[PDB]
């Protein structure tokens, strides 16, 4: 409780024992609020059922809280300087494995196979480094990993885009990408005062529950995502305009794109940002057949 890593004094004591200096280049902002940490663990429903992938353990503030509930925790940490610290701070916990490696170069599926054979369910729970929040989430989702869900702390503005409702000004290609694979919900907003050092931007905790199969039925995922990106490329322009200018087929096959919009009952004159994920799926299947 009060003796845990994540108290302001305890955190400082550790950092001082090792003379640790933060690297803003690695998004190092450590949690020093045990109620926040416990809250995150609650939102991830971590029990003895659960094997947990943690990204960016730091000096172990969240790791410790996860370790008390989970069957097993594996934590990827990029900073070699933290490794001896974690060995010390997490010495009371025998269910923790730290792997020294940038999560973006890891083969997470192999790690899951090797480490979590005895777990009923796998969660990702993490206070993410803000400089690569979106790459990390995209990697985890793109690779169809056998996860129940992902609960992470990240920039507020990023959570808001991930979880965006279609009426939200934050609705975008990122909303669609996340919501294709998951049900997304921003569950907490956290002040800057619960970290050391305090971050420059606001923070939030988002909860992503992996869907049993994709949200919509599309012929071709690759094509679907490129279409999404082309459609949102300029906020104020028509969907047609965006497609002509952003699909490489756009300026070669414009008439075919106009025919498909007509055939799928989607007014080109609407903005791309008006389209729901279902309309995007319909448009994508129609275009994929025509385009190819
Ligand atoms: C925001 S801090 C959070 C630390 C700790 N989880 C906490 O809440 O106190 C981010 C952590 O991610 C680590 N990190 C940064 N980039 C990384 C990457 N690509 N892969 C794995 N860890 C990374 C940092 O070294 C740092 O420990």
Swiss-Prot record:
<keyword id="KW-0963">Cytoplasm</keyword>
<feature type="binding site">
    <location>
        <position position="102"/>
    </location>
    <ligand>
        <name>S-adenosyl-L-methionine</name>
    </ligand>
</feature>
<comment type="function">
    <text>Specifically dimethylates two adjacent adenosines (A1518 and A1519) in the loop of a conserved hairpin near the 3'-end of 16S rRNA in the 30S particle. May play a critical role in biogenesis of 30S subunits.</text>
</comment>
<dbReference type="InterPro" id="IPR023165">
    <property type="entry name" value="rRNA_Ade_diMease-like_C"/>
</dbReference>
<feature type="binding site">
    <location>
        <position position="31"/>
    </location>
    <ligand>
        <name>S-adenosyl-L-methionine</name>
    </ligand>
</feature>
<comment type="similarity">
    <text>Belongs to the class I-like SAM-binding methyltransferase superfamily. rRNA adenine N(6)-methyltransferase family. RsmA subfamily.</text>
</comment>
<dbReference type="InterPro" id="IPR001737">
    <property type="entry name" value="KsgA/Erm"/>
</dbReference>
<dbReference type="GO" id="GO:0000179">
    <property type="term" value="F:rRNA (adenine-N6,N6-)-dimethyltransferase activity"/>
</dbReference>
<dbReference type="InterPro" id="IPR029063">
    <property type="entry name" value="SAM-dependent_MTases_sf"/>
</dbReference>
<keyword id="KW-0698">rRNA processing</keyword>
<dbReference type="InterPro" id="IPR020596">
    <property type="entry name" value="rRNA_Ade_Mease_Trfase_CS"/>
</dbReference>
<dbReference type="GO" id="GO:0003723">
    <property type="term" value="F:RNA binding"/>
</dbReference>
<dbReference type="GO" id="GO:0005829">
    <property type="term" value="C:cytosol"/>
</dbReference>
<keyword id="KW-0949">S-adenosyl-L-methionine</keyword>
<protein>
    <recommendedName>
        <fullName>Ribosomal RNA small subunit methyltransferase A</fullName>
        <ecNumber>2.1.1.182</ecNumber>
    </recommendedName>
</protein>
<feature type="binding site">
    <location>
        <position position="77"/>
    </location>
    <ligand>
        <name>S-adenosyl-L-methionine</name>
    </ligand>
</feature>
<dbReference type="GO" id="GO:0052908">
    <property type="term" value="F:16S rRNA (adenine(1518)-N(6)/adenine(1519)-N(6))-dimethyltransferase activity"/>
</dbReference>
<feature type="binding site">
    <location>
        <position position="29"/>
    </location>
    <ligand>
        <name>S-adenosyl-L-methionine</name>
    </ligand>
</feature>
<feature type="binding site">
    <location>
        <position position="127"/>
    </location>
    <ligand>
        <name>S-adenosyl-L-methionine</name>
    </ligand>
</feature>
<keyword id="KW-0694">RNA-binding</keyword>
<dbReference type="InterPro" id="IPR011530">
    <property type="entry name" value="rRNA_adenine_dimethylase"/>
</dbReference>
<dbReference type="GO" id="GO:0031167">
    <property type="term" value="P:rRNA methylation"/>
</dbReference>
<feature type="binding site">
    <location>
        <position position="56"/>
    </location>
    <ligand>
        <name>S-adenosyl-L-methionine</name>
    </ligand>
</feature>
<dbReference type="InterPro" id="IPR020598">
    <property type="entry name" value="rRNA_Ade_methylase_Trfase_N"/>
</dbReference>
<keyword id="KW-0489">Methyltransferase</keyword>
<keyword id="KW-0808">Transferase</keyword>
<dbReference type="Pfam" id="PF00398">
    <property type="entry name" value="RrnaAD"/>
</dbReference>
């Amino acid at each position: 409780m009060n003796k845990d890593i994540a108290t302001p004094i305890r955190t400082k004591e550790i950092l001082k024992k090792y003379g640790f200096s933060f690297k803003k280049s690695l998004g190092q902002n450590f949690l020093i609020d045990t109620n926040i940490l416990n809250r995150i663990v609650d939102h991830a429903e971590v029990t003895e059922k659960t094997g947990v992938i943690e990204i960016g353990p730091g000096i172990g503030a969240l790791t410790e809280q996860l370790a008390k509930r989970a069957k097993k925790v594996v934590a990827f940490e990029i900073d070699q300087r933290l490794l001896p610290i974690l060995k010390d701070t997490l010495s009371p916990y025998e269910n923790v494995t730290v792997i020294h490696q940038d999560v973006l170069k890891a083969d997470v599926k192999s790690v899951i196979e090797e480490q979590f054979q005895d777990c009923d369910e796998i969660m990702v729970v993490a206070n993410l480094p803000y400089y690569v929040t979106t790459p990390i989430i995209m990697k985890l989702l793109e690779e169809h990993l056998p996860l129940k869900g992902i609960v992470v702390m990240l920039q507020k503005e990023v959570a808001e885009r991930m979880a965006a409702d279609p009426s939200s000004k934050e609705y975008g290609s990122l909303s669609i990408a996340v919501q294709f694979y998951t049900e997304a919900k921003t569950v907490m907003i956290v002040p800057k005062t619960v970290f050391v050092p305090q971050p420059n931007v606001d923070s939030a905790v988002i909860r992503l529950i992996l869907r049993d199969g994709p949200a919509v039925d599309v012929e071709n995922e690759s094509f679907f995502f490129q279409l999404i990106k082309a459609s949102f490329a300029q906020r104020r322009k028509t969907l047609l305009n965006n497609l002509v200018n952003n699909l490489p087929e756009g300026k070669a096959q414009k008439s075919t794109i106009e025919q498909v919009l007509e055939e799928t009952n989607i007014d080109g004159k609407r903005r791309g940002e008006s389209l729901s994920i279902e309309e995007f799926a319909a448009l994508s299947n129609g275009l994929y057949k025509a385009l190819f």
